[PDB]
Design a protein around this ligand. Structure first.
Ligand SMILES: [Pb+2]
Ligand SMILES: [Pb+2]
Ligand SMILES: [Pb+2]
Lengths: 280, 276, 276
């Protein structure tokens, strides 16, 4: 006897926006869990196959100085930004590789007590902001849940601030499976980092601040769609995972939303990449 | 076993003026225990103009008569942890009554514990502080990063309207020269990158590490030694106690001492000589 | 027969930190024979965070599915000999993927046998090695001497960047206390003055023999016994397997065990508890 595994097949790409336009922008987000290793595992090959206009990475865990030439020298993205690229904090680090240079790129969220770890890069474009983030994990024994609660409050404030100026796309590893449909075992994880009531509420509040979970908006009933699987116990081959990676959009960008895909087929990390298709 | 002898006192300042202000700071590791270990005897011998104590861990109510009755310091100020507990705590004993004394840094979340006392004198502000320890497994590190930001802002504020002297256990070895084993303590409270950067930011805000200013190449000079591993007898310690001065006070700086000979705690006292 | 009982596990470091890293090293004397002898069963009981194996003598293509498919260790690394030879071969199985894994010590002279794997983690380097045996009649003692020099240089290179933990069969009983019959083996591989000196030189380069550091007077503690003459039953063995730490890591050292009751090879495993 045994319980059968329920696999997920990402639907075909919808290349038409809500308001009828053709997709002309492609943004990919990927928690690479150690960029050096991800690169050796050929992650860049997949990136070239996806050929996104903007590539956002989380958990690079590599000081900018230690970045392999394979990625810093990529012709595809003449504008690369690295954060937390500190060797001393090898448990963070984010990056944004753009084909087009933004108006301005900032690091962190304007709160020095939060910006010591490279978790957020914000690129400003004429029409909107692109924010990629590696949210603080509540960690083992929830020993960092208090800080995570403060972070959610501050990060939300920061996002609402930006939203007041221009619409924005928030993407990355938000270290939270919003609802039960967002993870295989909600019962056994309610006291674990990523699925505590507090983290879930924080995300609910962010959405109620005027933002939308792109994937959930397009597929409100699609279960078993995850972006993370613990490397342990062949979890991925059984599709026993969590949906921790999102593309959250401010209301004004929904008309331009075409699709929000989960490339659960791309290997190289315990997270798979997610791709957003927009009409801008 | 490299040892360290503190140089002889330099009673002449940068601009020539003779030292005329003597300030001592000391993490007493429990004021009640420290007093029983004859801490006050050393104080009377050092005879500072102002005594700043950190980690007193004793609510006023419970303060021992031996210290509250000291006739040498008529003006005493105690900062305890609001919750009437006796956690942390700092004190400042003076021979001269300051123009004004305040507690905390104007931040409820931080003023919940007794960590700061600001005494305003005609020439300068004297701020003594017991900075939050990141603690075991760096569990309070995030809290510490927030403290560092707010405390810095607070100090900059005071520095804007008057020169200040900051003293106490800042719970951080700024550079590698500030501790015996930097390599193995990277993930230890007091030597994390976040804590180091925090101190650098404070200095970059217009402040000077008195001791390092006077002895930039002097190593093995520590103010802390873990009670464990017989660290002190081997001088395997950290430099966690400082006298951080506003630029304007540099001319009057005479010397910054480390009395590693005084016992009674896992921290030794530090004394500052100023010409104000 | 003078036997040895390994003391209970100590899970707190010298500086007071609770163990957060468990590493096991084991010379399996042929991975294939070992797996069949149920070595993995024991491995699952010990359940270390990282498992290092030496003398695997098995091409990756020939590895038994029983080990390559262990769900417990998602990240496995194999270092075999050039043409799938049965000489040496080491492996490292990790629960957490390291930042970077490299093979050999940067010298084709020594990297033709799969003797070393270096895993770089955020706070330290984990190196597992299978040191070249001086072999029969010391016919390979010269090469071994060359090896000790380069390997020491290699470890020093890494140490200058990050602290490291070195584990594996280092093929040497450091001192007389590390083997049952010192006098009879002074001219045999593993106890020549040269090999001993080499190990001594390594420690003086800034490293510590974990086990001897915790139990300086503990005799009869071995990790190897020849299969012949019931050596293991009489506990006539050698201590050839170590956990050598950058001295900086000492305060983080909790315990260094010798699991002499675990069977399956002519070596028993050793386990290290660390606070990283
Ligand atoms: Pb990770
Ligand atoms: Pb204490
Ligand atoms: Pb065998």
């Amino acid at each position: 006897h045994m319980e059968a595994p329920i696999l997920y097949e990402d639907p075909p790409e919808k290349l038409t926006s809500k308001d009828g336009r053709a997709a002309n922008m492609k943004i990919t987000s990927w928690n690479v869990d150690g960029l050096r290793a991800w690169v050796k595992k050929n992650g860049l090959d997949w990136v070239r196959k996806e050929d996104p206009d903007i590539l956002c990475l989380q958990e690079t865990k590599c000081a900018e100085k230690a970045l392999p030439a394979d990625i810093t020298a990529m012709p595809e993205y003449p504008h690369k930004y690295w954060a937390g690229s500190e060797d001393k904090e090898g448990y963070s680090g984010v990056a944004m590789l753009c084909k087009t240079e933004p108006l301005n790129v900032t690091y962190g969220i304007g709160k020095e007590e939060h910006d010591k770890e490279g978790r957020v890069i914000t690129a400003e474009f004429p029409d909107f902001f692109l924010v990629t983030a590696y949210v603080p994990n509540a960690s083992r024994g929830l020993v960092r849940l208090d800080y995570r609660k403060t972070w959610d409050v501050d990060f939300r404030a920061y996002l609402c601030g930006l939203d007041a100026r221009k619409p924005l796309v928030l993407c990355g590893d938000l270290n939270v499976a919003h609802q039960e449909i967002d993870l295989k075992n909600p019962k056994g994880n309610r006291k674990n980092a990523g699925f505590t009531p507090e983290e879930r509420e924080g995300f609910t509040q962010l959405l109620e601040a005027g933002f939308t979970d792109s994937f959930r908006e397009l597929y409100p009933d699609q279960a078993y769609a995850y972006t993370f699987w613990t490397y342990m116990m062949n979890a991925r081959s059984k599709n026993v995972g969590w949906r921790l990676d999102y593309f959250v959009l401010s209301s004004a960008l929904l008309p331009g939303l075409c699709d929000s895909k989960i490339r659960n087929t791309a290997m190289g990390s315990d997270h798979c990449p997610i791709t957003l298709f927009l009409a801008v």
